[PDB]
């Protein structure tokens, strides 16, 4: 039921009458979802879709299938002054739906060993990788972000949401008064009825939030932060039951 970035990008292209798109930067070789990867570059301001004077050597239709070349192609903004812009970073941003935040809370960080800190940092990087395959990647939010985590984290800090303060203040800054807290000892299993909530806390407390005025839905999954997230995204986006 929930749209992906590629769905939003496809519908934006279809709305403008564009049936296939090529690329001028060779940075998309070995790509599972071409439209998702193109949309990611655009939504982060790296380039746009342009009309080009000559047909590309190859293109992909709106289903991602390789077709003959197109008169429309992605290019970086470093090649902007030449061609007609057709789908800009600004146009695509305005069509994004209000996707939920996925929060990794880093209070308790200084309580882990150095090996466990490394495992956490890797899992947060893998969680960003998942979210940039479905949404923009900016839905990943790390609260209580410290410099040690930033040194250990090897992903793009400019694309994930990082917050120096507590989870409750991050939520209040963003007008979120109700969250799902992934808890393995919760009595209620996560279900489709929980997918209207605007934030999911997937890593890292519940009492802390509730004393701060946040409604907390304790929900369990039937482990690694990125595994948890991947299960949630398959439920929300692909409509799959938890058995997947």
UniProtKB/Swiss-Prot annotation:
Q: Which GO terms describe its biological process?
A: tRNA methylation; tRNA processing
Any one of the GO CC terms: cytoplasm
Keywords, sorted A to Z: Cytoplasm, Methyltransferase, S-adenosyl-L-methionine, Transferase, tRNA processing
What GO molecular function terms would the record report?
tRNA (adenine(9)-N1)-methyltransferase activity; tRNA (guanosine(9)-N1)-methyltransferase activity
Question: Ranges for the SAM-dependent MTase TRM10-type domain?
Answer: 88-244
Localisation: Cytoplasm
- Principal localization reads cytoplasm
The record's catalysed reaction(s) read: adenosine(9) in tRNA + S-adenosyl-L-methionine = N(1)-methyladenosine(9) in tRNA + S-adenosyl-L-homocysteine + H(+); guanosine(9) in tRNA + S-adenosyl-L-methionine = N(1)-methylguanosine(9) in tRNA + S-adenosyl-L-homocysteine + H(+)
Q: What class of enzyme is it?
A: transferase
Signal peptide boundaries = none
Q: What is its EC number?
A: 2.1.1.218, 2.1.1.221
Recorded family membership: Belongs to the class IV-like SAM-binding methyltransferase superfamily. TRM10 family.
Q: What is the recorded function of this protein according to its Swiss-Prot or TrEMBL entry?
A: Catalyzes the S-adenosyl-L-methionine-dependent formation of either N(1)-methyladenine or N(1)-methylguanine at position 9 (m1A9 or m1G9) in tRNA.
Protein name listed in UniProt: tRNA (guanine(9)-/adenine(9)-N1)-methyltransferase
**Source organism of this protein record:** Thermococcus kodakarensis (strain ATCC BAA-918 / JCM 12380 / KOD1) (Pyrococcus kodakaraensis (strain KOD1))
Classification lineage: Archaea, Methanobacteriati, Methanobacteriota, Thermococci, Thermococcales
């Amino acid at each position: 039921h929930m749209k992906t970035l590629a769905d939003v990008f496809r519908e934006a292209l279809k709305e403008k009458g564009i049936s296939s798109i090529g690329t001028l930067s060779k940075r998309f070789r070995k790509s599972k979802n071409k439209l998702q990867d193109i949309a990611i570059e655009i939504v982060h301001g790296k380039g746009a879709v342009f009309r080009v004077p000559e047909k590309t050597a190859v293109a992909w239709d709106l289903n991602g299938n390789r077709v003959d070349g197109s008169y429309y192609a992605y290019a970086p903004l470093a090649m902007r002054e030449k061609f007609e812009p057709v789908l800009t970073p600004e146009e695509l941003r305005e069509k994004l739906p209000d996707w939920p935040y996925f929060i990794i809370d880093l209070y308790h960080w200084d309580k882990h060993t150095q090996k466990e800190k490394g495992k956490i940092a890797l899992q947060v990087n893998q969680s960003y990788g998942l979210l940039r395959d479905y949404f923009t990647g900016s839905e990943l939010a790390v609260t209580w972000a410290n410099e040690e985590f930033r040194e250990m984290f090897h992903g793009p800090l400019d694309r994930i949401t990082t917050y120096g303060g507590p989870t409750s203040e991050f939520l209040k800054e963003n007008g979120i008064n109700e969250v799902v807290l992934l808890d393995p000892w919760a009595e209620e299993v996560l279900s489709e009825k929980d997918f209207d909530v605007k934030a999911f806390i997937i890593g890292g407390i519940g009492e802390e939030l509730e004393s701060a005025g946040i409604k907390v839905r304790r929900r369990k999954i039937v482990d690694r932060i990125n595994r948890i997230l991947g299960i949630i995204l398959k439920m929300m986006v692909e409509g799959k039951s938890m058995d997947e």
